[PDB]
Paper text:
[name] ([name]γ) is a nuclear receptor (NR) transcription factor that regulates gene programs that influence cellular differentiation, metabolism, adipogenesis, and insulin sensitization. NRs are modular domain transcription factors with an N-terminal disordered activation domain (NTD) containing the activation function-1 (AF-1) region, a central DNA-binding domain (DBD), and a C-terminal ligand-binding domain ([name]) containing the activation function-2 (AF-2) coregulator interaction surface. The general mechanism of NR-mediated gene expression occurs via recruitment of transcriptional corepressor and coactivator protein complexes, which bind to the AF-1 in a ligand-independent manner and the AF-2 surface in a ligand-dependent manner. , In the absence of ligand, [name]γ recruits corepressor proteins resulting in repression of gene expression, which is then activated upon binding an agonist ligand. Hyperactivation of peroxisome proliferator-activated receptor γ-mediated transcription promotes tumor growth in urothelial (bladder) cancer, which can be inhibited by compounds that repress [name]γ activity.
Author numbering:
A (entry chain B): 203 to 261, 275 to 477
B (entry chain D): 2260 to 2272
The structure:
Amino acid sequence: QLNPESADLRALAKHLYDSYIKSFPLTKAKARAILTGKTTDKSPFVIYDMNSLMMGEDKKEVAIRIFQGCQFRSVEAVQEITEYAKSIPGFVNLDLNDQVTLLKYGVHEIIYTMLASLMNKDGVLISEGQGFMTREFLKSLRKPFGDFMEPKFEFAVKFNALELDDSDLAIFIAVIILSGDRPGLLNVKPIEDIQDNLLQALELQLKLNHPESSQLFAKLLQKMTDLRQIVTEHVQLLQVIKKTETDMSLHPLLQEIYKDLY
Amino acid sequence: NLGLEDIIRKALM
Ligand SMILES: *c1ccc(C#N)cc1-c1cc(=O)c2c(F)cc(F)cc2[nH]1
């Protein structure tokens, strides 16, 4: 029914969506527009192999340095999420220690959600959208770099096939931040109260926006399980790096590309 | 992570 309680849940979805637009300049729509070839101004250049990697050149341990470079390039991402989170009603009133825990775990899952926006089944956008690195070229790289991205492409293709838009993703991301099961939380009940209300608004938003999917609410919450998995897969990745004593050599151009991913 | 939580704390300010 259209009543005060629903109107408020549509008011929250709007407030979130507007905040989401202010915080995050690269929308999914902007990103999708580039992948499907709609942009004719300075179209992205494809890197699909070694020879094309040299041509695209004009625009510690190797693994540790890739990871430090991508964290530094992710500082602006972390800041924009924190800004987004401060606009979620009730967030700034939570224990300051808990705000940090929510965000310290949320960021990685949210960055993978946005990274899916940059991926299709052929590859991924890089260099602020001036490059397109193929999925098969990444998979073809030597161990252990060859396996870095391929679990994320598999996740990203399912997620993208649900056809969420920026309105959907704003509430989704707000559900991710206000997760009451993070380790170290002190006052779970106020976090869950917020999340419960955010889930009501997410449910409604998916009913009005996605008639073609009767269990899309369920399937989207399942995708939170899969996001945490990629995050745990990175920890394993660090152990595979420690044990590795094969030549960890990698073209400096590939290291720069990899500093653009996550 | 210690740097990460440091970035977050500065942002929340
Ligand atoms: C950055 C650049 C490329 C890759 C790959 N493959 C991974 C990163 C990166 C670095 C980092 O410190 C991370 C985390 F601390 C937590 C994560 F869930 C992912 C992550 N990815």
